[PDB]
Structure 1
């Protein structure tokens, strides 16, 4: 049989699967993993897809987008997601990771899906909490919002960031849905002096975009190549990719021109 991915209400992708391997459901989440000849495994998390054999792309891009634009990363914060692969890539920097997910049952359900699952959980500097109000008070050098945040969430994380911090969050694809990306940028602008959209170059099977927001640190100006060339075992990330990620066509630069803070 097969499952379907939603890119637009008038455009869907259909993935053929070998068999369903797992089905975990909690109070506010539903997880299903399927056997796949194209990607090995496909996890459907609340009308959302994860492709095992390609988990390295997004995890590397977001991790290093921040880690190579900053000097030191001592405290990083990740919220509203189950992406432990991101944490693994972040552990290629001397840093502590406060990971927040209220649904332990689901996060652990990814035990054999995230290749670096035990490695990340075994980390002495990896702290899992069900809620932000479980953590100790501190500011973060980097915060990752794995889910498009509303104006509320935005303001609540902007306050836990450091003056020289960077906040990376998710949005929609800027070309496919420039309107939505425009609204994403508008929110972000209200509190940051830097708000620029980027995508994962070469990733063609997903309507997804992201934002690099800060109080001063620029994603290109502050780009540091020595921290890039020092990364070990990455298979997607590199400086070419970094810079290409922010490339915007003439039209979109124009439509977004009053929403982009560089």
Structure 2
């Protein structure tokens, strides 16, 4: 048996799977978990794949890129996603996390997919809310957007940010789809003094990119090695990966030159 994902209008991927473990459709989302001989378990969340085998990669990368570049981490915000592993890694810091996901049904259906599901859901500092209006208002130190946000989502989130604030969001892969990344950066630049694209080194499995945005916090210059070396039980993240994540070939640097708010 096999399943397929379109990573491009001219490129698909075929995955051999040994079984279908779960299926839960919602009035807004559809999730399906498959058993994989390669990735252990593959979760298909609305035309996007998640490999149980490599949940530590993106979770460790985003969480610690934020954590190790911020002097103070007390309030975090995570919108537009179901990734509780990000949360598990962020808790390796002394911080509070506000998770906003309206789709409980889908979210709870990850009960076995995410290794640290319970450890995250039962954290005293972890508060899960259906929507934004369900949270005490305040300004955060780090905001995460799990789906490429638009100009509005960007603005709405930028005001909920502290002067010191940092915003890490998702976009397409800078090489495969430089035009998408270019647009994602332009949007980010409109309100942030620091807008820089990066990727997950060695994570050769997804057409995905990311942007590190802020008002006055540089992702390379404000990296604090001591916070890095102090982290425990990390299997992917380190300083080499962090810096390498921002490497760009010659041409691409030229292409994103003025959209890159370094």
Structure 2-normalised TM-score? 0.99
Matches of 1:92 and 1:6, distance apart in 2: 35
Distance in 1 (CA, whole Å) between partners of 2:174 and 2:6 is: 16
Take 1:116 and 1:47, find their aligned partners in 2: how far apart are those partners? 24
**Residues 49-71 of structure 1: CA distance to partner in whole angstroms, max 9, x if unpaired?**
00001100000000000000011
Deviations 1:200-222 (Å, cap 9, x if unpaired)?
00011110000000000000110
Q: Counterpart of 2:70? A: 70
SS at match of 2:203: coil
Alignment of 1:118-133 (within 5 A): 118-133=118-133
Deviation for aligned residue 1:75: 0.1
Q: Which residues of structure 2 form unaligned runs of 5+?
A: none
Partner SS, residue 20 of structure 2? strand
How far residue 110 of structure 1 moved from its aligned partner, in angstroms, is 0.1
The offset of 1:5, in angstroms, is 1.9
Corresponding residue number in structure 2 for 1:237: 237
TM-score normalised by the chain length of structure 1: 0.99
Provide the secondary structure at the position in 2 that maps to 1:24: strand
Distance 2:259 2:36 in 1: 40
Tell me how far 1:4 sits from its aligned partner: 1.1
The offset of 1:133, in angstroms, is 1.1
Q: Partners of 1:64 and 1:6 in 2: how far apart?
A: 30
The structure 1 segments of at least 4 consecutive aligned residues displaced by more than 6 Å after TM superposition are none
How many angstroms does 1:105 deviate by? 0.4
Partner Cα separation in structure 2 for residue 5 and residue 23 of structure 1: 17
Q: Structure 1 residue 228: deviation in Å?
A: 0.1
1-side partners of 2:19 and 2:220: how far apart? Answer: 44
SS of equivalent residue, structure 2 residue 137: coil
User: Shift of residue 11 of structure 1?
Assistant: 0.8
Does residue 1:115 correspond to 2:139, yes or no?
A: no
Q: How far is 1:153 from its partner?
A: 0.2
Cα RMSD over matched residues?
0.5
Q: Distance in 2 between matches of 1:156 and 1:138?
A: 13
Aligned partners of 2:149, 2:48: CA distance in 1, in Å?
17
Q: How far, CA to CA, are the matches of 2:238 and 2:168 in structure 1? A: 18
How far 1:39 sits from its partner (Å)? 0.8
1:111-138 deviation per Cα after TM superposition (whole angstroms, max 9, x unaligned): 0000000000010000011111111110
Tell me the SS of whatever aligns to 2:258: coil
- Count of aligned pairs: 262
Distance 1:119 1:130 in 2: 20
Please state how far the C-alpha of 1:231 moved relative to its aligned partner. Answer: 0.5
Give the C-alpha shift of residue 72 in structure 1.
1.5
Q: CA deviation at 1:242?
A: 0.3
Task: Quote the offset at 1:171 in angstroms.
Answer: 0.2
CA–CA separation in structure 1 for the residues paired with 2:255 and 2:50: 31
Question: What is the Cα deviation at residue 15 of structure 1?
Answer: 0.4
